[PDB]
Design a binder for this molecule. Structure first.
Ligand SMILES: *[C@@H]1O[C@H](CO)[C@@H](O[C@@H]2O[C@H](CO)[C@@H](O[C@@H]3O[C@H](CO[C@H]4O[C@H](CO[C@H]5O[C@H](CO)[C@@H](O)[C@H](O)[C@@H]5O[C@H]5O[C@H](CO)[C@@H](O)[C@H](O)[C@@H]5O)[C@@H](O)[C@H](O[C@H]5O[C@H](CO)[C@@H](O)[C@H](O)[C@@H]5O[C@H]5O[C@H](CO)[C@@H](O)[C@H](O)[C@@H]5O)[C@@H]4O)[C@@H](O)[C@H](O[C@H]4O[C@H](CO)[C@@H](O)[C@H](O)[C@@H]4O[C@H]4O[C@H](CO)[C@@H](O)[C@H](O)[C@@H]4O[C@H]4O[C@H](CO)[C@@H](O)[C@H](O)[C@@H]4O)[C@@H]3O)[C@H](O)[C@H]2NC(C)=O)[C@H](O)[C@H]1NC(C)=O
Ligand SMILES: *[C@@H]1O[C@H](CO)[C@@H](O[C@@H]2O[C@H](CO)[C@@H](O[C@@H]3O[C@H](CO[C@H]4O[C@H](CO[C@H]5O[C@H](CO)[C@@H](O)[C@H](O)[C@@H]5O[C@H]5O[C@H](CO)[C@@H](O)[C@H](O)[C@@H]5O)[C@@H](O)[C@H](O[C@H]5O[C@H](CO)[C@@H](O)[C@H](O)[C@@H]5O)[C@@H]4O)[C@@H](O)[C@H](O[C@H]4O[C@H](CO)[C@@H](O)[C@H](O)[C@@H]4O[C@H]4O[C@H](CO)[C@@H](O)[C@H](O)[C@@H]4O)[C@@H]3O)[C@H](O)[C@H]2NC(C)=O)[C@H](O)[C@H]1NC(C)=O
Ligand SMILES: *[C@@H]1O[C@H](CO)[C@@H](O[C@@H]2O[C@H](CO)[C@@H](O[C@@H]3O[C@H](CO[C@H]4O[C@H](CO)[C@@H](O)[C@H](O[C@H]5O[C@H](CO)[C@@H](O)[C@H](O)[C@@H]5O)[C@@H]4O)[C@@H](O)[C@H](O[C@H]4O[C@H](CO)[C@@H](O)[C@H](O)[C@@H]4O)[C@@H]3O)[C@H](O)[C@H]2NC(C)=O)[C@H](O)[C@H]1NC(C)=O
Ligand SMILES: *[C@@H]1O[C@H](CO)[C@@H](O[C@@H]2O[C@H](CO)[C@@H](O[C@@H]3O[C@H](CO[C@H]4O[C@H](CO)[C@@H](O)[C@H](O)[C@@H]4O)[C@@H](O)[C@H](O[C@H]4O[C@H](CO)[C@@H](O)[C@H](O)[C@@H]4O)[C@@H]3O)[C@H](O)[C@H]2NC(C)=O)[C@H](O)[C@H]1NC(C)=O
Ligand SMILES: *[C@@H]1O[C@H](CO)[C@@H](O[C@@H]2O[C@H](CO)[C@@H](O)[C@H](O)[C@H]2NC(C)=O)[C@H](O)[C@H]1NC(C)=O
Ligand SMILES: *[C@@H]1O[C@H](CO)[C@@H](O[C@@H]2O[C@H](CO)[C@@H](O)[C@H](O)[C@H]2NC(C)=O)[C@H](O)[C@H]1NC(C)=O
Ligand SMILES: *[C@@H]1O[C@H](CO)[C@@H](O)[C@H](O)[C@H]1NC(C)=O
Ligand SMILES: *[C@@H]1O[C@H](CO)[C@@H](O)[C@H](O)[C@H]1NC(C)=O
Ligand SMILES: *[C@@H]1O[C@H](CO)[C@@H](O)[C@H](O)[C@H]1NC(C)=O
Ligand SMILES: *[C@@H]1O[C@H](CO)[C@@H](O)[C@H](O)[C@H]1NC(C)=O
Ligand SMILES: O[C@@H]1[C@@H](O)[C@H](O)OC[C@H]1O
Ligand SMILES: O[C@@H]1[C@@H](O)[C@H](O)OC[C@H]1O
Ligand SMILES: [Cl-]
Lengths: 446, 446
């Protein structure tokens, strides 16, 4: 809702002030959701392509991250049968599908050659765990606080590297490798595995050098905690255990704690690798209810992560399929719907591409939010969020950008999906525009 | 889960460092939940008393806040029929029950004489709103951005004070008065009412003097937003509209944004007035899953609010009854179960009574959390949270508390509910103790 009133906001953008390098937005097709996106029956191949294009085409959804589950369940793991001991031998199996995640990754790469693939195990194979199953939490055998018949850490590290080798042999490079999902949480009934930071360091000290031997440019994550606080605690313990240099990227989910402060790690980026409305009905609205599932709320949640916790990337939970509101695109039979959450993602990531660097951006109005990003090639994106219920006349002063010639204005609100509104020549270093209520307006500088 | 290893933590508590004055913990019986706590069949009267005692007895749950809905629905409002205009006559009706909230409040007061009653409207009566109904959001007629046939602001302010008058005539002091619930959110199907901060100020400028003339000691809240960020935006706009001194307390919910920083008000306390696990099954565990419903997680959530947003109070959604995990005490027929979330509440509020002041407390270990509270009468509570998965040997150095002579230690974990562990004399200003894993240990100094 909105009403008639106008106020003004002053914004300063400064390319000389430089923060995190951005990675992108994304989503997962784990647990067979990739197969719902690529079912053959129901959704036609043309429509399967179109849904994947909508997500990963730079000009539409703008996403770049595909998060795949390194599966540990029957039919989803590269190690369906374990050897008796870590001495092996190991019989690795690849079916060319990977629960359709290979289809998702290959197709997304077709639409985005800069795809950033995150391969993330939810659990070690059961034989490698204290509980002897991939379900019900438990620990990698061999970390402190365990007493298995053998130490399985090297074997688990080798198994993760073998998963990466399967994708590499198909011509797909993995960018990030993770060994746990939500180690602070035991959901009991599906792939899970628990850890504190001392135990995680006991594994990372074997995983990290094992990975760099095979793939010197493959980054290692820690540790996909359910919330930012839980992630900070694991990071603290990893560093206290001596493992500061046994991971490269801090990963965390937004379910069980949200930050307003950076993470307790020096020289490492962080990615919010999973969040969704896990309980509500499927929802597409931008700003009708004000509920957390809506597109405008997701634009604001991202602004918070990128400006207050220096976050470099952001993932929805699932990409597309069923699961009510856990997807960005709902699929039913041969039909689909796009949530306007995707236009919140695109408002950032259609314009701030991989390798962009967040730069200084301030606003004189508390709920007229701004951030700004400078691509490797010098183009600059300034997503402004007018979270107020009436228009703001913004004045944007540009510093360090005298080389820019043109400005394009894009608008997302209840009647616009990243719509091009205006294109003009820059004839100084000041931009003036009226941003409608409850909207994201992106100023694209070239 | 836990394992065998012991590390040490150094804690410094300084009474010369002072922060917020505490109000307490609490819950609501709104929307008929008070009638589930005091039903006409099922739970016996003796068990109704016992449930309420478990919540509001200082020695058990330790709660002090009862949050009541000033109802606007048929059967639940003091204005069942509206006049055609704001001139009235207003035929108010008081039924002595208030959807059993009178019974809840009266009984809670019997167990806690310092009860802090928060009377909170979810909506104005529909006749005073743009939408003509108490449901479906909409605005108070007369604030900016409305075009109703009449300006109903004074009428709504008089209605709210009349509700207070009915309680005060029955011998119950109301401590806080609120005129919106979640004005950033339209749930459509139940009592609701929308506002930004400019519109809110347009009403508060009427409500506030009306309130203080009738009840000089009655505080006014703003504005029970669904989250901290939404609350900060409304507070910004109220202040921008000139209304900094037309409200006394900042109220907010933890559903749609959680803080790690203070609120944008000077000289006003804040209360987290509503949160719960809104979607999960009934849950009582302390630390089994690591899911946000568990008692340990609530201890940590409260530690965050009290130490990082200087929060003075904290409310569960409902007190007792049905509604799965939305209550602190689940009632089924003539039976009831207590969630260990209540022992997270008690660990703070059994010992930090109303009027206590949070004081300096630091920890040398990131996930050994500490806060500290000094009661008006000089006693001091130090709730320590060992969020690690193994025991910590803590050394607590006390500054500014030479007059303390005795220390009692209380423990909450998977097998203790605020259990008294030890009582010793205080010699020197140094306490030493081992805090078990995944536990809240309270040091009570007298
Ligand atoms: C400051 O401040 C602070 C805070 O506030 C304080 O403190 C506090 O105080 C308060 C007041 O006093 C209190 O309260 C009270 O209480 C009472 C009771 O008591 C009892 O109980 C308790 C508890 O118990 C429990 O717990 C424990 C621990 O753990 C244990 O051990 C036990 O066993 C139990 O347990 C159980 O339960 C639980 C829960 O609770 C659980 O958990 C478990 O498991 C189990 O089950 C206790 O504590 C006590 O004891 C104590 O004390 C005694 C004396 O008495 C002694 O002898 C002992 O020894 C002890 O002490 C020791 O210990 C402790 C701990 O325990 C420590 O702390 C110390 O220090 C020492 O060391 C007992 O046993 C009650 O009763 C009360 O009530 C009342 O009041 C109210 C209000 O307030 C009301 O409402 C009610 O109703 C009543 O009223 C009445 O009374 C009054 C007076 O009293 C009046 O006013 C009125 O009017 C009425 O009157 C009527 O009635 C009467 C009778 O009663 C008659 O007489 C007449 O005539 C008429 O008729 C109250 O509530 C609390 O407690 C406290 N806290 C603490 C923590 O401590 C302080 O003090 C201050 N200080 C200054 C200096 O100021
Ligand atoms: C610095 O970095 C910047 C960031 O990367 C970079 O800007 C971006 O560059 C890339 C790469 O060049 C651009 O992506 C290409 O886009 C081509 C299609 O472009 C046409 O469509 C665009 C989108 O059009 C929609 O949106 C417009 C804006 O709202 C509307 O006006 C349109 O009507 C249309 O709207 C419809 O769709 C919307 C969703 O998209 C929807 O909301 C809306 O409602 C409606 O449904 C237009 O922007 C573009 O128009 C501009 O350019 C034309 C000139 O072509 C002008 O005439 C226009 O006036 C306007 O200025 C076009 O109309 C793709 O074809 C192209 O695909 C190829 O590349 C990808 C990989 O990048 C491959 O996967 C793909 O297969 C293609 O590969 C083929 O070609 C390549 C070589 O091109 C070759 O190597 C390969 O082998 C193969 O043969 C690509 O995706 C991107 O658009 C730019 N973004 C922005 C914001 O500008 C910038 O240039 C860099 N600067 C410098 C100096 O280096
Ligand atoms: C400290 O504080 C804690 C927290 O308040 C106290 O611990 C809690 O106590 C309550 C009782 O006051 C417990 O609830 C009861 O739990 C028992 C045990 O249930 C378990 O074991 C059963 C036997 O093996 C098993 O049947 C149960 O499984 C069924 O139920 C679960 C849960 O509903 C369900 O998921 C399953 O599918 C099964 O259907 C379960 O594994 C239980 O027997 C009790 O049920 C009786 O009462 C209820 C009404 O309350 C009624 O519905 C039943 O029909 C039956 O009549 C009841 O649920 C609770 O589990 C405890 N929680 C924790 C974390 O321990 C503790 O007591 C306090 N300490 C002290 C000293 O007071
Ligand atoms: C910008 O981006 C937004 C968000 O992606 C787009 O808006 C969404 O578009 C989808 C698809 O068109 C909408 O979904 C469809 O909504 C129709 C309207 O439903 C309402 O109204 C009818 C009566 O008019 C009621 O019966 C109904 O209950 C709703 O209240 C539905 O009729 C559609 O249902 C059909 O398809 C589904 C499968 O998806 C079947 O299950 C049904 O049986 C039926 O055949 C469908 O649900 C969605 O509502 C839009 N959301 C919003 C917020 O607008 C914009 O279109 C896009 N802009 C542009 C220009 O492309
Ligand atoms: C999420 O978005 C959906 C649309 O995808 C909203 O759906 C409306 O739901 C109500 C009842 O809940 C229906 O009366 C409307 O017809 C629906 N609209 C459409 C366009 O389908 C839903 O309200 C949104 N939920 C939230 C919490 O914002
Ligand atoms: C919340 O607490 C309840 C106990 O009140 C837990 O209940 C267990 O549920 C499983 C099935 O989900 C049963 O097999 C167990 O027997 C139950 N335990 C008890 C003691 O009843 C529930 O698991 C907890 N949920 C979370 C998320 O922690
Ligand atoms: C998935 O990919 C494989 C190989 O790329 C292909 O053989 C198979 O048909 C694909 N499945 C679907 C549903 O597209
Ligand atoms: C570990 O398990 C083995 C096999 O049961 C047992 O013999 C050994 O004592 C255990 N170690 C410890 C330290 O308990
Ligand atoms: C509410 O309180 C009154 C007395 O104040 C009592 O008579 C009535 O029975 C109570 N109602 C319930 C449901 O307990
Ligand atoms: C207010 O609404 C009425 C119709 O209900 C309309 O006639 C009138 O012009 C409106 N007032 C203004 C100032 O627009
Ligand atoms: O679904 C889980 C949710 O219930 C919990 O709160 O956070 C982690 C999620 O995996
Ligand atoms: O139930 C509501 C929830 O859906 C929303 O997320 O936050 C406010 C709550 O009242
Ligand atoms: Cl927290």
């Amino acid at each position: 809702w909105s009403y008639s009133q106008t106020l003004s906001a002053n914004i300063q953008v400064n390319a000389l002030q430089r923060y995190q390098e951005m990675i992108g937005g994304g989503c997962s097709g784990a647990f067979g959701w990739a197969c719902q996106q690529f079912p053959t029956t129901g959704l036609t191949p043309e429509n399967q392509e179109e849904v994947t294009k909508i997500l990963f085409d730079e000009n539409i959804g703008g996403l770049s991250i595909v998060r795949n589950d390194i599966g540990s369940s029957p039919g989803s793991t590269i190690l369906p049968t374990c050897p008796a001991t870590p001495a092996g031998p190991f019989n690795y199996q690849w079916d060319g599908s990977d629960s359709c995640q290979f289809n998702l990754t290959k197709t997304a790469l077709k639409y985005n050659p800069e795809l950033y693939v995150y391969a993330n195990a939810w659990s070690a194979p059961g034989c490698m765990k204290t509980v002897g199953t991939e379900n019900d939490g438990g620990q990698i055998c061999g970390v402190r606080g365990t007493n298995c018949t053998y130490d399985w850490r090297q074997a688990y590290a080798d198994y993760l590297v073998q998963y990466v080798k399967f994708y590499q042999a198909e011509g797909i490079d993995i960018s990030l490798l993770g060994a746990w999902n939500e180690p602070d949480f035991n959901p009991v009934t599906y792939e899970s595995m628990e850890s504190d930071g001392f135990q995680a360091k006991d594994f990372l000290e074997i995983l990290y050098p094992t990975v760099k031997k095979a793939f010197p440019n493959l980054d290692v994550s820690c540790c996909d905690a359910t919330g930012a606080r839980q992630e900070r605690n694991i990071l603290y313990e990893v560093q206290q255990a001596g493992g500061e240099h046994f991971f490269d990227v801090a990963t965390w989910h937004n379910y069980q704690s949200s930050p307003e402060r950076p993470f307790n790690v020096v020289g490492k980026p962080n990615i919010m690798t999973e969040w969704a409305d896990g309980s509500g009905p499927w929802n597409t609205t931008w700003d009708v209810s004000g509920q957390l599932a809506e597109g405008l709320q997701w634009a604001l949640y991202m602004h918070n992560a990128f400006t207050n916790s220096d976050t470099s990337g952001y993932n929805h939970w699932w990409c597309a399929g069923g699961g009510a509101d856990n997807v960005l695109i709902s699929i039913t039979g041969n039909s689909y719907e796009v949530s306007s959450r995707l236009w919140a993602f695109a408002s950032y990531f259609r314009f701030a591409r991989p390798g962009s660097v967040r730069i200084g951006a301030t606003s004189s109005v508390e709920n007229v939010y701004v951030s700004a990003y400078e691509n490797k090639n010098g183009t600059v994106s300034i997503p402004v969020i007018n979270a107020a219920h009436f228009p703001y006349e913004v004045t944007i002063d540009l510093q360090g950008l005298k080389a820019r010639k043109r400005v394009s204005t894009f608008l997302t609100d209840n009647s616009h999906n990243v719509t091009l509104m205006d294109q003009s020549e820059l004839h100084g270093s000041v931009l003036k525009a009226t941003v409608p209520p409850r909207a994201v307006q992106v100023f694209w500088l070239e």
